[PDB]
């Protein structure tokens, strides 16, 4: 299957994001044949969204919209960066977009080479101010509208941008290529065979003979896989995406529980305290009807289980209303296997009232 890359455009309302995206689709179709937009290069398939609003983007990211692998910052060369260009880039930094490419639009309306260079240097300096690698950032001098009007010269610049999408955004790592992880759903005992834990392999592959760690909730344990099965039939291995039962050596039924994960040794750790970005459902989205305050003590649902936590609101924030998005520091009552980027639900009484992403593990 052709690699999938999630990109997005960000920039001033007037600087041509829509025109560019249309031009990318048009030129890639003419060249290579065949809400969000999609387009393909010979080597990659792209899903492309717009980022018109800061809060809107953060909410979308939290509620499930796949994070951008890369962003295209669109700046018209006629103006150069706007004051709010730093807020566009600051959004990128805040959600941690791994790469930014710049498309300098409307270069057909700028005659002076020295002026294009001033604009370019400003953009590089802004990028570096927010710790993007401004010196090494690809900047394409193009014209969305003229490319869309089929001017050969400017079509080539659309193809150039596409080349950088291809070369500068590394191929996103596939689940199967990541270190093994299975979230445990159920635990059964089998006499004359031993303990079996079930779940859907989230990443990687588990084979008979391989060591695993059992991580979260309780002190980590290690075991060896002595079998893998699917609907009571033995498999040589279990792969990412597959619902399996993993048979374990020696370890006993009472020593393992739902909410723990099976993992390749050394690749995931349990934590209790983390920084997060959260979104609280509105009433119409089936959420809370009323605000909560500093003493709110919900459950945090990680993969297969709830863990109670307390919260620390940001400085100056005393109230959270339905529909809000905010940052919060969460301290769980016991550890759970986690990495930066892990999504969770916020629940009360077993009902989902919000969503979050782990931004930064602390302890």
């Amino acid at each position: 299957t052709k690699p999938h890359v999630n990109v997005g455009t960000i920039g001033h309302v007037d600087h041509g994001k829509t025109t560019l995206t249309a031009a990318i689709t048009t030129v890639l179709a003419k060249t290579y044949g065949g809400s969000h937009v999609e387009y393909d290069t010979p080597t990659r398939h792209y899903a492309h969204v717009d980022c018109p609003g800061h809060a809107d983007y953060v909410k979308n990211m939290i509620t499930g919209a796949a994070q951008m692998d890369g962003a295209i910052l669109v700046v018209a060369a006629t103006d150069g960066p706007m004051p709010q260009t730093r807020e566009h880039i600051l959004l990128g930094r805040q959600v941690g977009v791994p790469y930014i490419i710049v498309f300098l639009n409307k270069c057909d309306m700028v005659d002076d080479e020295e002026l294009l260079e001033l604009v370019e240097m400003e953009v590089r300096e802004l990028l570096s101010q927010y710790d993007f690698p401004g010196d090494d950032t690809p900047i394409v001098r193009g014209s969305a509208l003229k490319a869309l009007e089929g001017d050969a010269e400017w079509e080539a610049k659309i193809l150039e941008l596409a080349g950088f999408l291809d070369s500068y955004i590394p191929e996103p790592e596939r689940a199967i290529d990541k270190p093994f992880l299975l979230p445990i759903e159920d635990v059964f005992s089998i006499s004359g065979r031993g303990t079996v834990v079930t779940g859907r392999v989230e990443r990687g592959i588990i084979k008979v003979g391989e060591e695993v760690e059992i991580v979260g909730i309780k002190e980590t344990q290690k075991s060896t896989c002595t079998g893998v099965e699917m609907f009571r039939k033995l498999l040589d291995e279990g792969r990412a995406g597959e619902n399996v039962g993993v048979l374990l050596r020696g370890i006993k039924r009472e020593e393992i529980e739902r909410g723990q994960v099976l993992a390749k040794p050394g690749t995931i750790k349990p934590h209790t305290k983390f920084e997060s970005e959260v979104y609280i459902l509105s009433k119409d989205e089936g959420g809370r009807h009323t605000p909560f305050f500093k003493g709110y003590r919900p459950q945090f649902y990680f993969r297969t289980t709830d863990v109670t936590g307390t919260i620390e609101l940001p400085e100056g924030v005393e109230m959270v209303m339905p529909g809000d998005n905010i940052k919060m520091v969460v301290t769980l009552i016991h550890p759970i296997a986690m990495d930066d980027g892990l999504r969770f639900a916020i629940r009360e009484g077993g009902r989902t009232v919000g969503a979050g992403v782990v931004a930064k593990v602390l302890g």
């Binding site: 309302v13 829509t18 048009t26 717009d50 060369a77 605000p291 305050f293």
Partner: protein, 279 residues
């Protein structure tokens, strides 16, 4: 004499568009001050072009000076601009002036700041609008800001800083439109009575039953729209009226603004807009 370096200098001073700077400087024979003046006239026409755009984002700001408080809405098109330091500084400057001058007529505030607004629009490239302003006067005043999107002023008697803050937070969350249930006019209560009786009647409730149910609904109605009849958001087993009585306090006034109130949410379909251009 229109060097890149001279263009650079004018751009750092004004934050104006690169090409706009080049043009103004060229017409001014290189005089920076004259170019800034030229850009000033140009800018009114740039802003006029944006004045028709819906500006439903922006900020609410509040400021108190003793017995006088101001609440203010300043709009822009995107929340990226609402966060920008320059937009923030403009809204703060407008606020400071409204407090200092005790200005409650938004057209006075608009007139005072039109030139600055235009220069800001010309450089930010979004419609910006000073939309509304109000004052609250009171013995004790407090405010609450729920981020930039909701602001509240509360006026009280007999209430300490914390109590006033908590009532302002309550108002922000629960949007009463009256202070007390008895402040709802007899005329409004009688109209709402007829609304509810019509509804109750057509659901098959016999007249005598409907009438008595609706009398109950009117108490619920004037409670729900009044501050003192609402359940206190921080302890909803009590009303705000009970809270105030526990503290031997009263509320004499409040005002809540929320950004974009009364401006229709424009929906955007990015995929469709891209397809439209793909002719």
């Amino acid at each position: 004499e229109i060097t890149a370096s001279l263009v650079k200098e004018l751009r750092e001073r004004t934050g104006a568009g690169m090409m706009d700077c080049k043009k103004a400087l060229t017409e001014a024979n290189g005089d920076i001050e004259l170019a800034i003046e030229n850009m000033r006239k140009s800018g009114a026409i740039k802003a006029a072009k944006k004045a028709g755009n819906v500006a439903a984002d922006g900020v609410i700001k509040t400021k108190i000076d003793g017995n006088y408080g101001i609440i203010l809405e300043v709009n822009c098109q995107t929340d990226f601009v609402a966060k920008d330091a320059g937009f923030q500084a403009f809204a703060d400057k407008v606020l400071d002036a409204a407090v200092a001058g005790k200005i409650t007529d938004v057209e006075v505030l608009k007139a005072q700041f039109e030139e600055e607004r235009v220069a800001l629009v010309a450089k930010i490239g979004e419609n910006i609008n000073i939309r509304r302003v109000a004052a609250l006067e009171g013995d004790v005043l407090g405010s609450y800001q729920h981020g930039a999107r909701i602001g509240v002023l509360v006026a009280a008697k007999g209430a300490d800083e914390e109590l006033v803050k908590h009532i302002a937070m309550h108002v922000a969350a629960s949007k009463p439109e009256f202070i007390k249930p008895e402040d709802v006019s007899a005329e409004v209560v009688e109209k709402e009575y007829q609304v509810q009786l019509d509804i109750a009647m057509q659901s098959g409730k016999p007249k005598e039953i409907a009438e008595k149910m609706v009398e109950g609904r009117m108490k619920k109605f004037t409670g729900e729209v009044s501050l003192t009849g609402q359940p206190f958001v921080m302890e909803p087993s009590k009303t705000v009226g009970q809270l105030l009585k526990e503290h031997n306090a009263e509320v004499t006034g409040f005002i809540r603004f929320e950004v974009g109130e009364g401006i229709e949410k424009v929906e955007t379909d990015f995929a469709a807009e891209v397809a439209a251009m793909s002719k």
